[PDB]
Amino acid sequence: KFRLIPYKQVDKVSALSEVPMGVEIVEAPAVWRASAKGAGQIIGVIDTGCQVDHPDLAERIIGGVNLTTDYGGDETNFSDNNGHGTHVAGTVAAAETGSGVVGVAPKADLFIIKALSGDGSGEMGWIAKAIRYAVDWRGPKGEQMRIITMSLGGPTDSEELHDAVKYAVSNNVSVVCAAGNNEFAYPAAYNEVIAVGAVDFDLRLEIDIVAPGVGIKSTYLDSGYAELSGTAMAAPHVAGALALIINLAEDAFKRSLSETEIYAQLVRRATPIGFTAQAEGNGFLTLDLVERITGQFT
Amino acid sequence: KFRLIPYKQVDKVSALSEVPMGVEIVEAPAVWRASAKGAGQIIGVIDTGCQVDHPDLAERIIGGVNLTTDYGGDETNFSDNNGHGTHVAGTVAAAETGSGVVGVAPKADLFIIKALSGDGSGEMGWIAKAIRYAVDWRGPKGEQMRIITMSLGGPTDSEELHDAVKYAVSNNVSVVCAAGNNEFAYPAAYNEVIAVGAVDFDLRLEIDIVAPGVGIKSTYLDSGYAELSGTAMAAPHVAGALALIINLAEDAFKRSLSETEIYAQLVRRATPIGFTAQAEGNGFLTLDLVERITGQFT
Numbered sequence: 378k379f380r381l382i383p384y385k386q387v388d389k390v391s392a393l394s395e396v397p398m399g400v401e402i403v404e405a406p407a408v409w410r411a412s413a414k415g416a417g418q419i420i421g422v423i424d425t426g427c428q429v430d431h432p433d434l435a436e437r438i439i440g441g442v443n444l445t446t447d448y449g450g451d452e453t454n455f456s457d458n459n460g461h462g463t464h465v466a467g468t469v470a471a472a473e474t475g476s477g478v479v480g481v482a483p484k485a486d487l488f489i490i491k492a493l494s495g496d497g498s499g500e501m502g503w504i505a506k507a508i509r510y511a512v513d514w515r516g517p518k519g520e521q522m523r524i525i526t527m528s529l530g531g532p533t534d535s536e537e538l539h540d541a542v543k544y545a546v547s548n549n550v551s552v553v554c555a556a557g558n559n560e561f562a563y564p565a566a567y568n569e570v571i572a573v574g575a576v577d578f579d580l581r582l583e584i585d586i587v588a589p590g591v592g593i594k595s596t597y598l599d600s601g602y603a604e605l606s607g608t609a610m611a612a613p614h615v616a617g618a619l620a621l622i623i624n625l626a627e628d629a630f631k632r633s634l635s636e637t638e639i640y641a642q643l644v645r646r647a648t649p650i651g652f653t654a655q656a657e658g659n660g661f662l663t664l665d666l667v668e669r670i671t672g673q674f675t
Numbered sequence: 676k677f678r679l680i681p682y683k684q685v686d687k688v689s690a691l692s693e694v695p696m697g698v699e700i701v702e703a704p705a706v707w708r709a710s711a712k713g714a715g716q717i718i719g720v721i722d723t724g725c726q727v728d729h730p731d732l733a734e735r736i737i738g739g740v741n742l743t744t745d746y747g748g749d750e751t752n753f754s755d756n757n758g759h760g761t762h763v764a765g766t767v768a769a770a771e772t773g774s775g776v777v778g779v780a781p782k783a784d785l786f787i788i789k790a791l792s793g794d795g796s797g798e799m800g801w802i803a804k805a806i807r808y809a810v811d812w813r814g815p816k817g818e819q820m821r822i823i824t825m826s827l828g829g830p831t832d833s834e835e836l837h838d839a840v841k842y843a844v845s846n847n848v849s850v851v852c853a854a855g856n857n858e859f860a861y862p863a864a865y866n867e868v869i870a871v872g873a874v875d876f877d878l879r880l881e882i883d884i885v886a887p888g889v890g891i892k893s894t895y896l897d898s899g900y901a902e903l904s905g906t907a908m909a910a911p912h913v914a915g916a917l918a919l920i921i922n923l924a925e926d927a928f929k930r931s932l933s934e935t936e937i938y939a940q941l942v943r944r945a946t947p948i949g950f951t952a953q954a955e956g957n958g959f960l961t962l963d964l965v966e967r968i969t970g971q972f973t
């Protein structure tokens with residue numbers, strides 16, 4: 378089985394009214410205006426489903442599929458019976474609703490892929506499909522996923538899933554996976570994946586980038602919110618960031634950019650914290666970095 | 676026909692003593708100790724050949740080949756019959772010899788692929804041969820090139836050229852080429868190519884990065900030196916830089932890096948001047964960037 382990278386439950390609550398600390402510590406709002414808050418980009422969330430009617434998520438969700446044996450399986454039913462999937466969605470794209478929470482890409486859309494059961498586990502074949510499907514899907518107007526995000530891991534170097542990964546990347550999809558806390562090694566170990574480690578809000582602890590992962594408030598079941606801590610919680614911040622990054626980079630270059638170019642655009646928005654490269658990769662996600670260094674010479 | 680992106684021959688000097696301003700402004704010397712001055716890396720200079728015995732170059736050249744009909748073409752004779760090739764080579768990697776000049780990677784090795792005639796031009800196929808030649812080449816001890824540099828352009832999108840290029844990129848050779856001033860479009864225009872634009876030392880102006888291109892002093896024929904101005908002159912700074920960057924990045928990450936990751940390693944060493952990305956790409960080559968941003972938050 379491939380499964381949710383373990384994390385801690387901290388809180389469940391019924392009410393929030395805030396921009397999470399991780400959304401702002403990563404400098405998303407500083408770039409919202411120039412990025413149109415991620416409009417025109419879709420993130421394929423590969424996870425346990427989503428609460429499709431959550432007040433924070435409903436106007437941001439556009440489709441989803443269920444690749445699981447849960448609920449039949451009715452492919453049309455990609456409700457969350459775990460909760461983790463809904464939490465991810467929130468960090469990526471919760472809307473400015475005048476309350477609850479707000480995501481890194483508050484104007485991007487979500488395509489929900491349930492490839493995990495309620496128990497947070499999934500057959501690997503489902504993950505391979507999830508990746509392939511997200512690549513091949515186009516919305517009714519021509520729209521497509523440039524971003525995949527998962528916070529799952531598996532002990533196994535499975536050729537079929539490595540293939541899906543190579544397939545996504547050669548078709549221009551950024552593949553974001555949370556670093557296994559080997560047991561959770563794949564698909565994050567794969568050279569072509571963007572692997573994301575975690576730090577806390579004090580910026581304390583094979584990855585490319587680190588983002589916030591301790592005490593991350595997001596949406597949760599029954600139209601509520603939960604606070605979760607762990608590695609799995611850093612990945613959705615980067616998935617969101619890419620929505621923003623793709624928009625601004627392509628607008629600046631006035632040109633389409635490849636998966637390769639897009640990756641370089643992400644990692645140049647990573648400020649090293651002073652930890653080692655194995656600990657932090659290229660550093661912490663600072664979305665305004667380019668603008669801070671523009672003009673700055675010796 | 677493909678030819679050298681046109682340049683002004685501003686001057687012919689015959690003796691020097693100095694690190695060139697292009698080499699310092701790019702901040703190569705700040706990164707010299709940690710990159711070990713480029714040792715271990717080999718750059719395939721695809722050009723007009725090189726004065727093999729240049730006092731500044733001889734110790735840096737481990738081999739070459741002549742894929743042209745000049746000199747026979749005796750494939751063993753890669754001597755320069757133009758001057759440009761010797762110039763490139765000096766910027767990429769002239770030696771610290773306490774006179775003449777010194778290159779961006781003064782301890783990197785040079786393989787000299789002469790695929791252009793004394794007249795600055797070459798049959799498209801020669802360039803394709805030359806790309807495929809540098810990728811496949813193995814040393815006496817199993818050395819290979821990770822870096823390809825050229826300053827040429829042709830009007831024609833020929834697939835044999837593009838495939839050659841894709842083939843260096845899937846084998847993790849970085850391919851570096853100058854963005855000419857539609858007649859010099861190829862191969863610079865190719866997505867997988869690192870296209871280098873030019874600025875002057877005042878940082879005044881489909882590209883990736885910009886580097887110095889005006890009044891560039893380097894090695895010339897007859898053991899001398901010359902100063903040239905033009906787009907073609909910025910590329911070598913970048914290919915030099917790569918030798919440097921591969922060593923310091925592979926050292927920090929404790930691991931081989933792919934050509935995609937190396938790419939990212941280059942563009943996060945580019946500071947933007949404050950043009951649009953269209954005009955300047957990712958910014959001006961600044962090797963010391965990561966050091967200076969380490970530790971630096973809102």
Ligand code: NA
Binds near residue numbers: 770
């Ligand atoms: Na010298």
